[PDB]
Amino acid sequence: NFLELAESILEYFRPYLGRIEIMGASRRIERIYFEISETNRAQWEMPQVKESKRQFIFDVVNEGGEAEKMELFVSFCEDTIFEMQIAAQI
Amino acid sequence: NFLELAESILEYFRPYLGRIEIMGASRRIERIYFEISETNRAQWEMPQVKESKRQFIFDVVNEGGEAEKMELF
């Protein structure tokens, strides 16, 4: 109910509240809720970045798909972070 | 804790301690721990032998893959 009266708040922040899941200290699954910069939410959904992601998923699924998956994935996130920093320069 | 203190032992023998699994006398799964000859860990990991396994796995997965699998292996 309370959430039901809260709706005008949540509708604004679903776009840019951030879920994830992590296997945390507890050795179960804490989930967390990071804030997201709006510029990022926009930045990850239009340009080279999208297809960059596609190249990523192709590169992982088709190849290296063992324990390396998370590794390579973080390499992607990091590269992509770097790219967005470069966008920030512009 | 005790295992934690012995690490410099185990780090040396993981390379060549040998696990396997067998369906033993108990008719469950005893697992055993054979010692590995040191030449063998390398001998199986470089030459014709490495590709030789690949010739094997193709010989089994693609063909004869019934009870023969352990037989042939």
Binding site: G18, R19, I20, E21, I22, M23, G24, A25, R28, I29, E30, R31, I32, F34, E35, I36, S37, N40, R41, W44, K53, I57, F58, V61, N62, M70, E71, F73, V74, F76, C77, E78, T80, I81, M84 | -
Partner: protein, 215 residues
């Protein structure tokens, strides 16, 4: 430039190694045929226009082998089309066998093995752009749990993407962790940062998702 061509040419290039080596196989075989031709049928290798003229007759081996790599590989109709047809010679029969064996072992097989290596190639890329979409729609990506567990609720797997993980979300989260000062972390945040620095990456879910945990 244009994306489609990148795909089309990619289709060739991913097998390009194999394909070039096939071209090597072409050259060699036709060389074997230039040897056999040099040792026997050089009579027939008149370049005469039409006859009783001092045509060089490719009896210099380099020119003979060039005579098969050119206007032999090019044949279509075989090597025999490009050289005067034997008739009544005792060597004629051995020769026509030569021409057929060359026509199969080169232009019917080998150009077909270029063609088919290209076709299999194109086929391969289609097969991989198949499976890539096929795995992300089945297995999650991060959890690995697969699009079947998540069928218990409506379009559940889709939710397991968009909300339970997406994939981006871990990205923005990593961005968050980067931009935050070390004091600013909540415990999960410091933890994730910690593993991220020690780079074990166990923290990303692995088959435990969240939904499977709990009930």
């Amino acid at each position: 430039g244009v994306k489609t061509l990148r795909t089309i040419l990619s289709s060739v290039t991913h097998n390009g190694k194999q394909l070039v080596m096939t071209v090597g196989l072409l050259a060699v075989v036709v060389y074997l045929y230039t040897v056999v031709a040099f040792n026997f049928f050089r009579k027939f290798y008149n370049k005469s226009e039409d006859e009783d003229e001092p045509d060089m007759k490719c009896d210099d081996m380099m020119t003979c082998y060039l005579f098969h790599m050119y206007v032999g590989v090019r044949a279509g109709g075989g090597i025999g089309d490009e050289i005067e047809d034997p008739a009544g010679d005792e060597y004629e029969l051995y020769r026509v066998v030569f021409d057929i064996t060359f026509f199969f072992f080169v232009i019917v097989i080998l150009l077909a093995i270029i063609q088919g290596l290209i076709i299999d190639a194109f086929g391969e890329l289609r097969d991989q752009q198949e499976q890539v979409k096929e795995d992300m729609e089945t297995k999650c990506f991060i959890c690995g749990i697969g699009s079947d567990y998540f069928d218990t609720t409506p379009h559940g797997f889709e939710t397991h993407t968009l909300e339970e993980h997406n994939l981006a979300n871990y990205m923005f989260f990593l961005m968050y962790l980067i931009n935050k000062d070390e004091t600013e972390h909540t415990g999960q945040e410091s933890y994730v940062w910690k593993m991220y620095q020690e780079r074990c990456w166990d923290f990303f879910p692995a088959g435990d998702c969240f939904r499977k945990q709990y009930e």
